[PDB]
Amino acid sequence: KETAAAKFERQHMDSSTSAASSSNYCNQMMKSRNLTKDRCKPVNTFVHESLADVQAVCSQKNVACKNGQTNCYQSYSTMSITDCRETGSSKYPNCAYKTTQANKHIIVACEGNPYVPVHFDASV
Ligand SMILES: [Cl-]
């Protein structure tokens, strides 16, 4: 059983590249992080920053989560991210994604001891 913290890392961290360099990034990544196994995950963001930088967000600007809980945090600074969203034609198991590279603030929900990201709420 994956911890919530480990699931976050698998779904959202990509420290290995500074940015998506092709329009096929999302197709490539969604597959390999096993986010298309059972169904096409519809929306998923990858963050191209160190794990330390992403964990540090839990110490930054406290905001409400979409769900009304108040354990979310917005990064003071922008981060390099890639936004992956399934195209309207996509059908499992031939999952297809639009890739959008950007520099935006991230908002994550944090939980636990240590107090670490367990959900990606949005980018700004
Ligand atoms: Cl979950």
Residue numbers in the entry: 1 to 124
What does the primary publication say about this deposited structure?
Toward this goal, the present work describes the use of bovine pancreatic ribonuclease (RNase A) crystals with a pore size of 4 nm (P3221 space group) for fixing [Rh2(OAc)4] and developing a heterogeneous catalyst to perform reactions in an aqueous medium. The structure of the [Rh2(OAc)4]/RNase A adduct was investigated by X-ray crystallography: the metal complex structure remains unperturbed upon protein binding. Structural analysis demonstrates that 1 h of soaking is sufficient to metalate the protein and that the crystal packing does not influence the binding of the metal compound to RNase A: two binding sites were identified for the metal compound, close to the His105 and His119 side chains, in agreement with that observed using RNase A crystals in a different crystal form. Overall, our findings demonstrate that the dirhodium paddlewheel complexes can be fixed in porous biomolecule crystals, like those of RNase A, to prepare biohybrid materials for catalytic applications.
Crystals of the adduct with [Rh2(OAc)4] were formed via soaking using RNase A crystals grown at pH 5.2. Hence, three different structures of the [Rh2(OAc)4]/RNase A adduct in the P3221 space group were solved. In all of the structures, two binding sites for the metal compound were observed, close to His105 and His119 side chains, as observed in previous reports. However, at this site, the remaining axial position of the dirhodium core (occupancy = 0.50–0.55) is coordinated to the Nδ atom of the His imidazole ring, and the dimetallic compound is equatorially coordinated by three acetate ligands and two water molecules. In the structure collected after 1 h of soaking, a double conformation of the His119 side chain is observed.
